[PDB]
């Protein structure tokens, strides 16, 4: 199907308690494959998936230099943004950036991204046409004028059209047996009385990859959105994911309830129910 590569970056200032902490991670689809943490002993970018460990020494050196370069510019930018926003130097502040690319099944670019947040809110984002910016406020418009004068969008566009797609293709081939083979959910329905006359039906999806899934309860074929407790999809810790959906059902009519499961690894969507 389609695939994505994304790099995430977080810098957090800690005034009076050292220089900002910088953490960056890289993903292919829902698989973490690289990390760098500036608080590590001798900080280097490190592998986190078996299919990237084969990259040579020049690879890890280049990645570490780029990570350190981002940590460096983020430290300066945190100081600059205090001025843009008229903020005191005593508080902790956060800069986040994500960039990367989505490719279709044919390996062509579908979308490129490069966007920033300050203290958890949109700051400046590259638009879908890779040749214009959306600034969230007047402070970000200062950065926009600088980046337009420096032709930053042109540099990012060249990367997103070229290296981003080309290296994603490389990773997808090297990791094909795990990155290109979806694991369908293992499913079951459990039953728990809460009274003599009401019971919880919980529809479980376990062990699936990628994380995208649809889990719904229907009553006579009608979605029970309001009455359903739907937990956030959560990592199992082994690169697969979990989710469940629960409804409280009055005694005697469990049979009107069906749980519907959609996942790209399933040969056919599932219609499940509680039966002893």
């Amino acid at each position: 199907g389609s695939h994505s590569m994304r790099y995430f970056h977080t810098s957090v200032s800690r005034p009076g308690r050292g220089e900002p902490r910088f953490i960056t991670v890289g993903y292919v689809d829902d698989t973490l494959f690289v990390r760098f943490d500036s608080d590590a002993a001798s900080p280097r970018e490190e592998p986190r998936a078996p299919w990237i460990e084969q990259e040579g020494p020049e690879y890890w050196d280049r990645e570490t230099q780029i990570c350190k370069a981002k940590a460096q510019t983020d430290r300066e930018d945190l100081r600059t943004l205090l001025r843009y926003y008229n903020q005191s130097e005593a508080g902790s502040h956060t800069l986040q950036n994500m960039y990367g690319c989505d490719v279709g099944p044919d390996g062509r670019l579908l979308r490129g991204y490069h966007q920033d947040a300050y203290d958890g809110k949109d700051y400046i984002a590259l638009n879908e046409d890779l040749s214009s910016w959306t600034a969230a406020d007047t402070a970000a418009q200062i950065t926009q004028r600088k980046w337009e004068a420096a032709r930053v969008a042109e540099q990012l566009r060249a990367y997103l059209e070229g290296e981003c797609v080309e290296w994603l293709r490389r990773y997808l081939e090297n990791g094909k047996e795990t990155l290109q083979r979806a694991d369908p959910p293992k499913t079951h329905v459990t039953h728990h009385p809460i009274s003599d006359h009401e019971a919880t039906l919980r529809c479980w999806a376990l062990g699936f990859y990628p994380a995208e899934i649809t889990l719904t309860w229907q009553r006579d074929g009608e979605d029970q959105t309001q009455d359903t407790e739907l937990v956030e999809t959560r990592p199992a810790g082994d690169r697969t994911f979990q989710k469940w959906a629960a409804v409280v059902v009055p005694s005697g009519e469990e049979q009107r309830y069906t749980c519907h499961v959609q996942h790209e690894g399933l040969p056919k969507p599932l219609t499940l129910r509680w039966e002893p």
Partner: peptide, 10 residues
Amino acid sequence: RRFSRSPIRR
């Protein structure tokens, strides 16, 4: 692999 010419200066 990462973008090597990330914007300096916000």
